[PDB]
Structure 1
Amino acid sequence: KNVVIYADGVYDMLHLGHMKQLEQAKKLFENTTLIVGVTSDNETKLFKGQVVQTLEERTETLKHIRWVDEIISPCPWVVTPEFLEKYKIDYVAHDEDIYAWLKRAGKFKATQRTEGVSTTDLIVRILKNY
């Protein structure tokens, strides 16, 4: 009955948006193991942009999140069929379609982001006292 879900991401400066997304992945089925992959500093910088926290800081924060059962840190940047078999993953949960092969296989589960609840959004709020 237990279903293995994989979610990957940067998880820089973890906020409520991240946490709700993790909750959503965790609750996709009645009985789940949520594995979370945390991307490397170098690959994140190269492919995505700047990152504030190190891999160690981003991983250690995630350890405290209720929905997270296992962490793969660092995780590969690109998910492969080999990776799914290596970790016995049943579904990939995520927000030229990179995920097309996952959808064809029936292994893709959509989750959603939450806007306006960002870490950076809170500084904007602090500054509107001046």
Structure 2
Amino acid sequence: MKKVITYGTFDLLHWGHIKLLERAKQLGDYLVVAISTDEFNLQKQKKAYHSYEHRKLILETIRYVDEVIPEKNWEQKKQDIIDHNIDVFVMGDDWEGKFDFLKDQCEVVYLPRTEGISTTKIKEEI
């Protein structure tokens, strides 16, 4: 079984998020999404409209998502790859090159973001 992992907040779920999940899932057989907890968001001074419990709840109903785990800090990535036996690590290309140190443990793939949509723009346009 080829396991894939990706990290993010997924606060006001939009089509850009969906396209990412779609493409990440097609890189394996099982997709795990690690999402920022509310404590971690506070550390990043990036408050999410929806709580961790609600963001997880909604993510768990998306066809592409197999499992959702909490992202509590910046450092947990290497152990997650080990703990969950991850074969593919996927991130948006705005992180291009940042996680190349994980390549000795799994395949690292940077997918281009979907243009014209993001959670802050939604908030700014409201």
TM-score range, shorter-chain basis? 0.7 to 0.9
1:92 has 2:89 as partner: yes
- Given that residues 6 and 35 in structure 1 are in contact (C-alpha distance below 8 angstroms), is that contact kept between their aligned partners in structure 2? yes
Whole-Å separation in 2 of the counterparts to 1:77 and 1:98: 16
Q: What SS does the aligned partner of 2:61 have?
A: coil
Is the Cα–Cα contact under 8 Å of residues 39 and 72 in structure 2 kept in the other structure?
no
| TM-score normalised by length of structure 2 | 0.81
1:15 corresponds to: 14
Which residue does the alignment assign to 2:31?
34
Aligned match of 1:116: 116
- The alpha-carbon distance between structure 1 residues 116 and 83, as it changes in their structure 2 partners (threshold 3 A), is same
Calculate the aligned-residue CA RMSD, in Å: 2.3
Give the letter aligned to residue 75 of structure 1: E
Larger Rg: 1
Residues 41-75 of structure 1 show CA distances to partners (whole Å, capped at 9, x for unaligned) of 12112215121110011111101111101111x22
Aligned positions, number? 120
Q: Which runs of 5+ in 1 are unaligned?
A: none
Aligned partners of 2:30 and 2:15: how far apart in 1? Answer: 21
Task: State, as a whole percentage, how many aligned pairs show the same letter.
Answer: 29
One-letter amino acid of the structure 1 residue matched with residue 107 of structure 2: K
